[PDB]
Design a protein around this motif. Structure first.
Motif, mmCIF file in Angstrom:
data_model
loop_
_atom_site.group_PDB
_atom_site.id
_atom_site.type_symbol
_atom_site.label_atom_id
_atom_site.label_comp_id
_atom_site.label_asym_id
_atom_site.label_seq_id
_atom_site.Cartn_x
_atom_site.Cartn_y
_atom_site.Cartn_z
ATOM 1 N N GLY A 43 -1.944 -4.051 11.329
ATOM 2 C CA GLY A 43 -0.988 -3.230 12.383
ATOM 3 C C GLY A 43 0.320 -3.438 11.273
ATOM 4 O O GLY A 43 0.409 -3.677 10.232
ATOM 5 N N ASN A 44 1.173 -1.954 11.550
ATOM 6 C CA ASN A 44 2.298 -1.638 10.205
ATOM 7 C C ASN A 44 3.693 -2.687 10.720
ATOM 8 O O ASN A 44 4.305 -1.909 10.854
ATOM 9 N N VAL A 45 3.657 -3.558 9.697
ATOM 10 C CA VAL A 45 4.680 -4.574 9.957
ATOM 11 C C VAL A 45 5.330 -4.855 8.476
ATOM 12 O O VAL A 45 6.471 -4.852 8.248
ATOM 13 N N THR A 46 4.819 -4.491 7.841
ATOM 14 C CA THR A 46 5.674 -4.003 6.506
ATOM 15 C C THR A 46 5.963 -2.465 5.989
ATOM 16 O O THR A 46 5.312 -1.963 5.927
ATOM 17 N N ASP A 47 7.384 -2.589 5.512
ATOM 18 C CA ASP A 47 7.414 -1.326 4.733
ATOM 19 C C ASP A 47 7.958 -1.437 3.739
ATOM 20 O O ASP A 47 8.968 -2.344 3.558
ATOM 21 N N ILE A 48 7.873 -0.552 3.392
ATOM 22 C CA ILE A 48 9.018 -0.268 1.581
ATOM 23 C C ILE A 48 9.991 1.564 1.621
ATOM 24 O O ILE A 48 9.605 2.020 1.831
ATOM 25 N N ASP A 78 7.247 10.611 6.666
ATOM 26 C CA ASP A 78 5.783 10.523 6.304
ATOM 27 C C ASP A 78 5.482 9.272 5.869
ATOM 28 O O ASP A 78 5.619 7.887 4.834
ATOM 29 N N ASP A 79 5.189 8.013 7.222
ATOM 30 C CA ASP A 79 4.807 6.304 6.982
ATOM 31 C C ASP A 79 3.660 6.152 5.632
ATOM 32 O O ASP A 79 3.856 4.620 6.173
ATOM 33 N N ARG A 80 2.886 6.873 5.699
ATOM 34 C CA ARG A 80 2.251 6.607 4.744
ATOM 35 C C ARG A 80 2.465 6.229 3.308
ATOM 36 O O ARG A 80 1.900 5.084 1.785
ATOM 37 N N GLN A 112 0.976 -1.342 -0.295
ATOM 38 C CA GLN A 112 0.511 -0.057 0.174
ATOM 39 C C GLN A 112 1.077 1.019 0.017
ATOM 40 O O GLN A 112 0.399 2.540 -0.618
ATOM 41 N N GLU A 113 2.245 1.159 0.730
ATOM 42 C CA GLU A 113 2.838 2.150 0.628
ATOM 43 C C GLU A 113 2.808 2.970 -0.978
ATOM 44 O O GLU A 113 3.261 3.673 -1.407
ATOM 45 N N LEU A 114 3.946 1.626 -1.575
ATOM 46 C CA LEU A 114 4.047 2.074 -3.135
ATOM 47 C C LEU A 114 2.740 2.652 -3.648
ATOM 48 O O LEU A 114 2.768 3.343 -5.104
HETATM 49 CA CA LIG Z 1 4.580 0.329 6.459
#
Ligand SMILES: [Ca+2]
Ligand SMILES: [Ca+2]
Lengths: 203, 527
Positions: free
Chosen positions: B72-77, B208-210, A152-154
């Motif tokens: 919850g927020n456990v994956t970041d790109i 910005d974590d979005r 979703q970030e992408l």
């Molecule tokens: Ca994330």
């Protein structure tokens, strides 16, 4: 019905649900793997292949992209063994027992395939392989990771870029903040503010 | 997935209650595996997802448990800055670094039934696998999971939850689980507990974590928060917890995925059902599940707004007066109580058309260019918060529509829905009833790989768990009832014969009937 399978008594009720009566956890977890294999061997096989990226071996080229994604994001057998080696020894042993029980059914079914291997194995012309504890971890990962993994970030970056191109940055930023907010304070919550007090914030 | 836990003070019997409803789709063989586990000091009955050596939905002698996906927020790109002269190099901590290239060999069954080899090449950086590569913009995107390498510790945590005999042991297990779930607990002494489990990164405060994090090294994770900072409560003062994947607590954030946690949220169906009753029992929990399963979810916030607008104009429009009457009388459900294949309330077909018309008028002009990415946000299955704020005139960052425009949308959407129904069906709401939507338990689950042959038996579509348990923790033992469709056993014989237990729970599921939750061996032997 009630039957003894090795050292465990298994009662299957009117819905076929197995109720396992074992003398200890080692025997219990082997029986648990065994009954799950009796009931679901082809499903287990394919769930494992999903995590390994070996579905296309059975279902053909239309699964290569899916298999690619799985190998890209997944772990080798040795990496999973390293995970298992970091568990409490008894827990590792019980996962090993569970794999031994699946394997016991595999061995039984390969010996009597016409009665004990389901139609899918006959249609697709292959046999189930034996299981190790690392394969049990793969069964966990193939489903549980789905609920956690997303890009979703992408998608958000793409939404913002397209809105900026269409409307200019100032307007796009406002639009984006309404699409994907930082924190909607009115969103319903499972724990309400009045359900408990955070002392540090002072009451 | 939905869940409820009821503490003693909110329970008609004074016993804590638990309801499970994991939404993992409808497949045959099923996504769940039901079992009873009994060894000295460990007695547990329930189901877990297929392949798991543990129960997730059910009860041991001491506690009942369930789970819902946490979101919850456990994956970041990470946005990797590529070398313009070499697209396999990215800049990280002061130097160009080489990506790790890997080639994997896939053995593939060809359309001729013979083996065929295909190779594919993928890349990794220090952050994780590369999921998107754009050489012409000198950027690649990699992916990091907060739980990388701890999946087996999460399995051990779940097994420990199975072996737990009290809240201390259950909470210890919860603290070890590293992936994002909500866990729910109820015991025989009337206690309930809720935990948003998982290992949550400590992120840079400069990003910005979005959106993706720049991968150049200045914005890396700084560890993981303590479990005490995870949202959790034992015996919350209101006496219950409900969840339908909604936000754990007011200040808990989830970055890019906030679209599921807005003011308009489907958990409202469960909140409404619990708040409308004083003390509740398992029969009430089932009625609430039924409501949630058949509700037109836009009704909660949008039906009052629609009614208010129509009432403003009804003195000059008798169609509006009629719709107000029909909307007020309607119980907000798309249900088929008389099994005739048509939803019972004709005004529900009007409301569906009205909503579709309204969403399109709100956003087609402005978001058409990004509709492939935003329709799933603005018409999300969990709620339509932005649409609600625009139509109700509440504060937004951008003025999507003026107040006059918003009212005009509500009215035009009504007029167009009326005109369509009048032309295709008739003047009275009974003529508008829509045929039911059905679903089957198919061959391919959320893992996106077929795992069997499915089933062709059609049942009414329900916004409902793939299994349900209803558990009362009496002083002596867990009691209650459950269903685990389609059936226990996925075996089909080579001659085509389905197991007798392949689909022998489908009628129970479709007809809102259950089988007893079995715990005492004397009962198991008679089951
Ligand atoms: Ca994330
Ligand atoms: Ca009907």
């Amino acid at each position: 019905d009630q039957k003894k399978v090795e050292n465990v008594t298994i009662i299957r009720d009117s819905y076929g649900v197995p109720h396992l009566y074992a003398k200890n956890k080692k025997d219990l977890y082997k029986a648990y793997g065994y009954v799950m294999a009796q009931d679901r061997l082809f499903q287990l096989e394919m769930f494992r292949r999903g995590n390994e990226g070996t579905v296309s071996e059975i279902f053909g080229e239309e699964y290569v992209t899916k298999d690619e994604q799985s190998r890209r994001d997944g772990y080798s057998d040795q990496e999973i063994q390293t995970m298992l080696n970091g568990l409490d020894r008894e827990t590792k042993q019980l996962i090993e027992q569970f794999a031994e029980g699946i394997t016991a059914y595999v061995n039984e079914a390969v010996k009597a395939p016409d009665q004990k291997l389901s139609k899918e194995f006959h249609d697709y012309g292959f046999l189930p392989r034996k299981w190790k504890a690392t394969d049990v971890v793969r069964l966990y990962m193939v489903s549980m990771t789905y609920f956690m993994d997303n890009h979703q970030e992408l998608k958000n970056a793409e939404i913002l870029a397209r809105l900026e191109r269409t409307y200019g940055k100032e307007k796009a930023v406002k639009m984006f903040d309404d699409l994907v907010w930082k924190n909607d304070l009115e969103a319903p919550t499972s724990i309400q503010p009045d359900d408990q007090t955070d002392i540090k914030k002072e009451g | 997935s939905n869940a409820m836990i009821i503490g003693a003070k909110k329970s008609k019997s004074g016993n804590a209650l638990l309801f499970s409803g994991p939404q993992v789709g409808f497949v045959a063989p099923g996504f769940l595996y039901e079992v009873g586990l009994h060894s000295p000091g460990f007695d547990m009955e329930g189901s877990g997802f297929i392949g798991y050596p543990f129960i997730m939905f059910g009860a041991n002698q001491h506690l009942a448990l369930t789970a819902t996906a946490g979101y919850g927020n456990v994956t970041d790109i990470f946005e990797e800055k590529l070398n313009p002269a070499n697209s396999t190099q990215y800049f990280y901590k002061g130097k160009w670094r080489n990506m790790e290239k890997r080639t994997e060999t896939f053995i593939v069954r060809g359309e001729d039934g013979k083996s065929k080899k295909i190779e594919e090449t993928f890349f990794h950086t220090v952050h994780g696998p590369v999921i998107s590569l754009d050489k012409e913009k000198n950027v690649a995107y990699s992916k990091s999971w907060s739980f990388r390498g701890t999946e087996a510790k999460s399995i051990q945590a779940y097994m420990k939850a199975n072996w737990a005999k009290n809240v201390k042991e259950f909470q210890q297990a919860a603290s070890e689980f590293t992936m994002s779930l909500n866990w729910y607990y109820a015991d025989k002494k009337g206690n309930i507990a809720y935990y948003h489990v998982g290992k949550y990164p400590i992120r840079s405060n400069q990003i910005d974590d979005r959106f993706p994090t720049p991968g150049t090294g200045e914005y890396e994770w700084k560890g993981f928060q303590s479990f005490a900072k995870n949202p959790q409560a034992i015996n919350p003062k209101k006496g219950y917890v409900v969840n339908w994947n909604n936000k754990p607590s007011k200040y808990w954030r989830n970055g890019e995925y906030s679209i599921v946690w807005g003011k308009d949220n489907r958990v409202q169906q469960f909140i409404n059902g619990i708040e409308a009753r004083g003390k509740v029992d398992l029969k009430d929990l089932n009625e609430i599940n039924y409501t949630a399963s058949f509700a037109q979810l836009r009704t909660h916030y949008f039906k009052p707004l629609l009614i208010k607008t129509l009432e403003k104009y009804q003195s000059e429009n008798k169609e509006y007066a009629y719709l107000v009457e029909q909307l007020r009388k309607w119980n907000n459900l798309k249900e088929d109580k008389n099994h005739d294949g048509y939803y019972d309330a004709g005004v529900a077909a009007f409301f569906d058309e009205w909503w579709n018309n309204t969403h399109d008028k709100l956003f087609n002009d402005s978001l058409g260019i990004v509709s492939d990415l935003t329709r799933e946000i603005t018409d999300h299955r969990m709620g339509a918060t932005l649409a609600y704020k625009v139509l109700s005139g509440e504060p937004t960052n951008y003025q999507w529509k003026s107040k006059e425009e918003a009212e005009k949308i509500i009215l035009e959407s009504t007029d167009e829905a009326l005109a369509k129904l009048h032309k295709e069906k008739g003047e009275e709401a009974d003529k508008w009833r829509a045929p039911i939507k059905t679903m089957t338990f198919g061959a391919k689950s959320l893992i996106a790989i077929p795992h069997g042959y499915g089933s062709k038996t059609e049942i009414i579509e329900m916004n409902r768990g793939s299994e349900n348990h209803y558990i009362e923790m009496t002083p002596k033992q867990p009691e209650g009832f459950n269903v685990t469709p389609p059936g226990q056993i996925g075996f089909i014989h080579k001659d085509g014969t389905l197991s007798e237990h392949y689909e022998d729970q489908l009628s129970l599921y479709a007809n809102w009937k259950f089988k007893p939750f079995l715990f005492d061996k004397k009962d198991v032997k008679r089951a």
